[PDB]
Amino acid sequence: RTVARDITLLECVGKGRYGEVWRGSWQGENVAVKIFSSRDEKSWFRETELYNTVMLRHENILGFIASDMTSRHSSTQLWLITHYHEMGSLYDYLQLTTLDTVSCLRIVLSIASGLAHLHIEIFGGKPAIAHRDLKSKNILVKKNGQCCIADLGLAVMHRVGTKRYMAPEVLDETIQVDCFDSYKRVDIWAFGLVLWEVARRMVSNGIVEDYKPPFYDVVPNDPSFEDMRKVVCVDQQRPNIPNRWFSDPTLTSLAKLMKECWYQNPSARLTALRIKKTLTKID
Numbered sequence: 001r002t003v004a005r006d007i008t009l010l011e012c013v014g015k016g017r018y019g020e021v022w023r024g025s026w027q028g029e030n031v032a033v034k035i036f037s038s039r040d041e042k043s044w045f046r047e048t049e050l051y052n053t054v055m056l057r058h059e060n061i062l063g064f065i066a067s068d069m070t071s072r073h074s075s076t077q078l079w080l081i082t083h084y085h086e087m088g089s090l091y092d093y094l095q096l097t098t099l100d101t102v103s104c105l106r107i108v109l110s111i112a113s114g115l116a117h118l119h120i121e122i123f124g125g126k127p128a129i130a131h132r133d134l135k136s137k138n139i140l141v142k143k144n145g146q147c148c149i150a151d152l153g154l155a156v157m158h159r160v161g162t163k164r165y166m167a168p169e170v171l172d173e174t175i176q177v178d179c180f181d182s183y184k185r186v187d188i189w190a191f192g193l194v195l196w197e198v199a200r201r202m203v204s205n206g207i208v209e210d211y212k213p214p215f216y217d218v219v220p221n222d223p224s225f226e227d228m229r230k231v232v233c234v235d236q237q238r239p240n241i242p243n244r245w246f247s248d249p250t251l252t253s254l255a256k257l258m259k260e261c262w263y264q265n266p267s268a269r270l271t272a273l274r275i276k277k278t279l280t281k282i283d
């Protein structure tokens, strides 16, 4: 039998220090091909090791197809092949789109569903997993208006995180590195920021905020570790909740939710499962 391995690379949809992402074609079917830089080879090994341990299958987790290592004359070529989501990242989608109540709730509940799936241990099953790099660039928008979580290169089972999204205990190095729940608490912090990014784009009474990244008003682009620690740990600043949210019952309930993700004390933060329940009772 013929094992068809040819993937036509059609267009580069991402370039960075990590390497590149391509829209590709396999047997007439779009796939996403992440080609890792030598700089980020450990992310390919960690994602491959995780999927060799547990084949994650969830509508809100980016769909795994293949890990490929190919021998080159002077080098090793590393590809991760996944489902392709043509609408792109939540980050990209929020730039150019506003949301209504239904589409705002559908987005954040689908992210919470993917995150609770990562976090939960199932006996028989899956280990508990923490993402450790949750952000709007690591979330893809599907045509049915739900999202899926991408990039398990930093994932831990039971490189550092994007500094803009680091929880206080990571910035001040008090995180209990031996406690698995510590890593879930770090993801909940970052989930609260993503919730804030999305909520800003939900229209109420004819008003919407411009897309902005978390802490846009208090740190530079490519903020330093020190920049983030002063804002988050020393001054204990949190993203602004605009007054206009308090005229809307959905945005009021989401403000409360994001506040309960942002406690300085990691152990006070909501679990992914509690966030899910709260979101199902909203509207």
Ligand SMILES: COc1cc(-c2cncc(-c3ccc(C4CCN(C)CC4)cc3)c2C)cc(OC)c1OC
Binding pocket: 002, 003, 004, 005, 006, 026, 065, 066, 068, 081
């Ligand atoms: C090596 O590499 C790649 C391979 C493939 C690929 C292509 N055709 C068929 C297959 C296939 C799947 C499953 C079986 C089963 C049959 C039943 N038996 C009891 C166990 C084995 C056989 C064959 C694969 C895995 C695609 C790839 O990319 C999309 C590959 O990576 C480049």
Ligand SMILES: COc1cc(-c2cncc(-c3ccc(C4CCN(C)CC4)cc3)c2C)cc(OC)c1OC
Binding pocket: 026, 029, 065, 066
């Ligand atoms: C990696 O990805 C894709 C792979 C394939 C593909 C190609 N040949 C054969 C297979 C296959 C057949 C049979 C078994 C099982 C079924 C019975 N069991 C008891 C033992 C053996 C497993 C696998 C597949 C899945 C198609 C895809 O989509 C069209 C893939 O996605 C891009």
Ligand SMILES: COc1cc(-c2cncc(-c3ccc(C4CCN(C)CC4)cc3)c2C)cc(OC)c1OC
Binding pocket: 013, 014, 021, 032, 033, 034, 080, 081, 082, 083, 084, 085, 086, 087, 088, 089, 092, 137, 138, 139, 140, 150, 151, 152
């Ligand atoms: C976060 O990380 C990973 C993401 C992906 C991935 C999967 N589907 C689609 C995309 C994508 C497609 C298209 C656009 C743009 C380009 C055209 N136009 C301007 C609007 C849309 C953006 C993004 C990506 C980037 C794959 C990965 O692995 C193979 C990733 O890493 C784990």
